[PDB]
């Protein structure tokens, strides 16, 4: 049931980090879970610092919300920023100090593919407005895997590319007119890229949309609340049809409605 985004609900806090290491981070579930994982499996990465390698894995939502991890993976190279996703059994993440996306197969703890995103800025060239080296933002939607970035040729405007999830080849690319550094974060729903206006305001908005199917850009005024005033990560999960976000120590989720 696809459609245009028309409403975002209030943020619900599912877990709060207890140390500064989790001031920012990414948490996620797999919209295409494969054995041995399920739709309840949750991953959490606290991303403050310069040697981020620990990925916390929880078999059950109850464990994610109240307990210790059921497994900790140690990535073979340090991860950059909050943009990572899980899709069809693999963590897709950006190597620190690089424009390289890595496919890390979770069950086998193996790197299956690596790809430089052609021309992408990295390490503070085209971050979102809060900084945090957020130059490269992976996304999953109803159609699969994407990457959101910018290039010098695009003059810092958001570029988005569909990715082959097996080998990380770029399949198609679109260029928006939205300055990446001017928005707080972005995500894709049903092939439309949406941006959030502010990472600090309790009265922010989903403020722009770009539809990859029609090429049309629009403004929007949909309310979006940063309850804790520092949102470092905002992604969409197409299986749950919810936003997942990280706001100033807090792992939160938002319900949505589509037309
Ligand atoms: Ca995002
Ligand atoms: Na992402």
Numbering used by the authors: 244 to 502
Paper text:
Inherited missense mutations in the myocilin (MYOC) gene, within its olfactomedin (OLF) domain, constitute the strongest genetic link to primary open-angle glaucoma via a toxic gain of function, and thus MYOC is an attractive precision-medicine target. Myocilin has no known function, and there is no glaucoma phenotype in Myoc knockout mice or in individuals with a homozygous N-terminal truncation mutation or hemizygous deletion of MYOC, but rare non-synonymous coding mutations lead to toxic intracellular sequestration of misfolded myocilin. However, not all mutations in MYOC cause glaucoma, and common variants are expected to be neutral polymorphisms. Among the common features associated with pathogenic myocilin misfolding, we demonstrate that a single metric, OLF thermal stability, can robustly segregate benign from early-onset disease variants.
At the outset of our study, five variants could be confidently predicted as benign polymorphisms: T293K, T353I, K398R, A445V and K500R. These mutations are all found on the protein surface and well documented in the literature. Three of these variants harbor conservative substitutions (Lys to Arg, Ala to Val). Assessment of spent media from cells expressing each of the 16 full-length myocilin variants revealed WT-like secretion for T256M, R296H, L303I, S313F, V329M, S331L, T353I, A445V, V449I and K500R. Analysis of the intracellular detergent-soluble fractions revealed E300K to be a statistical outlier among the variants, but T256M, S313F, N420Y, and A445V also presented decreased soluble protein levels compared to those of WT myocilin. Structural integrity was further confirmed by high-resolution crystal structures, which were solved for 11 OLF variants. No gross changes from WT OLF were detected for the structures of T293K, R296H, L303I, V329M, S331L, E352K, T353I, K398R, A445V, V449I or K500R, indicating that these mutations are accommodated within the native five-bladed β-propeller fold and do not perturb the dinuclear calcium-containing site.
